[PDB]
Amino acid sequence: SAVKAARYGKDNVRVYKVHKDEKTGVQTVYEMTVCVLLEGEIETSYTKADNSVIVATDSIKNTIYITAKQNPVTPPELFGSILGTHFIEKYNHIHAAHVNIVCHRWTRMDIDGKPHPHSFIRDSEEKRNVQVDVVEGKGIDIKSSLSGLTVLKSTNSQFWGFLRDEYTTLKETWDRILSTDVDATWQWKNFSGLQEVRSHVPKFDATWATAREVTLKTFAEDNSASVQATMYKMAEQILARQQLIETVEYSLPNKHYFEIDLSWHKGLQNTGKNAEVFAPQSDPNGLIKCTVGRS
Amino acid sequence: SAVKAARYGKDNVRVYKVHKDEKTGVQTVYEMTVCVLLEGEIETSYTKADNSVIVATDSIKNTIYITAKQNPVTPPELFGSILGTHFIEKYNHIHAAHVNIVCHRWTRMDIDGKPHPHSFIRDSEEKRNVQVDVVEGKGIDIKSSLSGLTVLKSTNSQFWGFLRDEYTTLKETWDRILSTDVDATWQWKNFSGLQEVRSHVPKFDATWATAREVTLKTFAEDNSASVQATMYKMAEQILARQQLIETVEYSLPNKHYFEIDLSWHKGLQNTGKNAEVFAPQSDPNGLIKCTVGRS
Amino acid sequence: SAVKAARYGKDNVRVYKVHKDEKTGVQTVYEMTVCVLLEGEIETSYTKADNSVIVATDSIKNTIYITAKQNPVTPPELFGSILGTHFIEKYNHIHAAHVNIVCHRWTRMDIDGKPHPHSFIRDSEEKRNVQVDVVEGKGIDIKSSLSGLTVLKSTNSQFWGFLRDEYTTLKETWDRILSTDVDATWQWKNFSGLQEVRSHVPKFDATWATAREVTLKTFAEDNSASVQATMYKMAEQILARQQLIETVEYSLPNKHYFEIDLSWHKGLQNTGKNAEVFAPQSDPNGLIKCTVGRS
Amino acid sequence: SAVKAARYGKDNVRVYKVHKDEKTGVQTVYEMTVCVLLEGEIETSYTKADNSVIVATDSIKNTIYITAKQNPVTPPELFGSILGTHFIEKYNHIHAAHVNIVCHRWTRMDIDGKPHPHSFIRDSEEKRNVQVDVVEGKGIDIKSSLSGLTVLKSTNSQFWGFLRDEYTTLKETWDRILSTDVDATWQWKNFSGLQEVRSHVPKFDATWATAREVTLKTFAEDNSASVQATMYKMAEQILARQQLIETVEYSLPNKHYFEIDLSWHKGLQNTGKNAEVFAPQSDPNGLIKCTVGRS
């Protein structure tokens, strides 16, 4: 037997950081969940009980807190690059660090029309994430994403013209509900190291904002021929707006809302043009994925 | 053996309804999860296998859809009163209906600064709920609530002066983080029946809005001496603003964020006045409850 | 405004305890989640910011650990009685303690046919719970329960003879699947205090075992006319077997498995007597409740 | 812009199947959740709104039910191979099918010491899974797994000798609790097609059973030097026992149970040799992974 691949570390490390402007009194909070997995010359911990090569996962947890104390935690693309670089520079036998960060929303409260200096609201479960892989000699690969963005439009979605055979019961339609939970990932070009990541810092927040805006506008305005077609249009625009992105991936469930035929009850009309009451379906659901890159 | 209490019905009935203004093109969606449990002269279904007294739970599900087709679904206090009244009027041997409604957020999207006519976003997991108990001869009792409103303030929360004995390790503090998931319930005065509920329809949305506003402002502005003290002030204001409410109940977890002592590492200062990085605790949590009524 | 009711404490306190027999080498583990809420003369913490009446929730957490160190944690009915008695005896102004305990399964592993001395498996998510209310001057009220016991039978369940009207579409049936998650609660007669609870210690484990056995046998052997009828038979037997129980309550979802008509595809027969493939429904579900007591 | 990768299908398809022996009266149930994603020449559905290349996801759902009606659903490795082969053979432009199956436990009840003919219990949340990738011209790749197997041992776990530096606070230990949720995957050698899979049918259930047995025995009997070391020993044995497996992967969380120092309270001794009461930690957790293959 041989170890073909090994990685280990600390998952589900919850971190909060507060920034206090002494000038203005204004406080800003950041809350994340962090995962760090390491690889390197660690095979003997598995094969020979040799713990001397193990940086304890508890020590990894400590490091995350220390790094957050001494560095900015935003944008998470920078924080994660700093964190991963740390492990491969500090430990000679560690050659890769895999850092995943989930950012939780704490949005400043408006009270009486004015931004409150130190109160916040979790205004939805949408997340901003990063995956950062720091590999000794091979630079820094960053995948940024948004997830848990739940949307619905009540009309201007169509689905017709699909393949019909002896397994098909689905009726063509020119007017349906479309609802999904958006998972969108943009993959940056490889960066040579931390100096290069630092050089692009302003692009990370801006690109996140553009991706969200494009997603929302396109969903709302597209007279959609299918989930496939709509999602392609989203990906095409993001790539057009940020040249340092190599690929954009979307993964979208099609969360079905079914018509309910009530005609058995006193001839009540609740289908097609007369559909007002629908049954949301918890399962099953369509799942549609696409990765779009440059020609 | 005797049946001392019995109730039965359909839970987790998901319902969507759309309203279409043909004038303006504007669509509005409502999505709920509904539970209906019935009581009455049904003991023999349990004791004698006599199913003749059972209105099938499947029929209850059908009724919910039919009622939603033929009536307004908002405010949920009205919808639930209509639904419960239906069962006790229609079936001679059914004498109580217990209706629980959870309303899910579908907030109209702003695209380019303009309200979109038919696209929506789930802008958080906060819910608006109602519990309606319709009892033959005893009217309609309505409890309205908001839940899942998650908030945090980074300062202006204190906790000092509490009882100290040989079980106490907690240090007094003059500056801490306060974070909670708000569950707030207001109980209306008993209504004689549907005509009376209809007569008060405008008060339901207005009171929900006031309760939310009061909760948020009070949390943000109170230099809090304890969760207990802050929540009392919220309840006092709601009761003052709506005379048709008899009681207000709050149930608030105290979701702890712990300081992390980093002084073992190079003398790093991260406690008291120097606290910047904290560890959110998933469990355990304080749980603080209060019911406030009129003197 | 006046405080009509108030309670506060610590929820979600996870506790593990190990017992080591030095004779035999055999270890036994117990794992619980505990909630303790207190009531008494504490209104001024809410109304006047008077924290002097508050036993901090952190201190409540400490107490739970200390009590578990110094006392047996099984049966949970005894542990919870000891814990609640502590608070009302120790603090003059605390007059009620409400203790909820959820016991998690750690079942000893069989390796090579022999019981292992110190390895355990979580052999399902079924829980054994207790709710203990200790009220100064009014003794100790104990509700014991099992929950999360998920069962299914593939035949010998019928549902016919129910009320049919213009809201009914459900077809009568003589052969269906029946599946549920059992929640069963037995309420003990009031106990005068801790000495009395101690006097009945052997009955707690025995009654839990009987309730589970009766539930399982009755479900498996009853040619069920309805959930209502089957659950009544379970409750009747428990009450017959343990005289110190006053009431038994069951709450049972009816988790539907629907036939799938495949006849549109090449005349495939998959309904009634020919039903082999079914669609489990996640929602909605029937919910059936009964409380049975003594005549 | 170009489509670099695309896949789509139906997720969360819940399926139940019953087998009835008319001889003996004995019924056996199977319950799964199935996901099928397809790839092929479908780019134009995304880029040109050309739905003619789409086999509707609703039709995929129908197919799953039809296939389950006409074929055995066990072992899931066979069912998934049949299902995936179907799509690539039936549709000329579909060239890959990705089939994921989660099998849920329905274990026959023992009532009075005898196996019941048609009643079942969900005896834990452990799953048996398969991932089957059927690729036109490249055969059938099957990954089998077990997941959600939760275990704990109260002693005979050690962790000492690890790297200590200025980020390390963790104390070496010779006696700790070890608890994990086992996720174990075995990857079969590529199969040329369905005839070859059929030829190995008996090996699938047998290998699943061996993997579970080896996992459980090794966990219980190993005087563990680390999670890394213990998991390696599990993987080595599986590979030794089944030659048609190419790799074994384990992913194991280290779910921490912390000592609680109670010495501040009346000198109570609850650490090291005197540790009886521990605090289970919900987060963070160690995460340890290994892929082991043949030399």
Ligand SMILES: O=c1[nH]c(=O)c2nn[nH]c2[nH]1
């Ligand atoms: O947008 C859609 N894409 C699909 O592939 C599909 N299949 N069924 N319904 C569908 N709707």
Ligand SMILES: O=c1[nH]c(=O)c2nn[nH]c2[nH]1
């Ligand atoms: O606001 C608070 N109330 C309490 O009762 C308490 N106990 N510990 N900490 C606390 N904070």
Ligand SMILES: O=c1[nH]c(=O)c2nn[nH]c2[nH]1
């Ligand atoms: O056992 C049942 N009880 C009910 O009350 C019911 N209603 N529909 N189906 C049902 N099955």
Ligand SMILES: O=c1[nH]c(=O)c2nn[nH]c2[nH]1
């Ligand atoms: O078994 C373990 N492996 C590890 O890598 C580790 N790190 N901390 N604790 C640990 N325990």
Ligand SMILES: [Cl-]
């Ligand atoms: Cl779909």
Ligand SMILES: [Cl-]
């Ligand atoms: Cl608290």
Ligand SMILES: [Cl-]
């Ligand atoms: Cl039902």
Ligand SMILES: [Cl-]
């Ligand atoms: Cl670990």
Ligand code: NA
């Ligand atoms: Na290195």
Ligand code: NA
């Ligand atoms: Na009536």
Ligand code: NA
């Ligand atoms: Na007292």
Ligand code: NA
């Ligand atoms: Na093909």
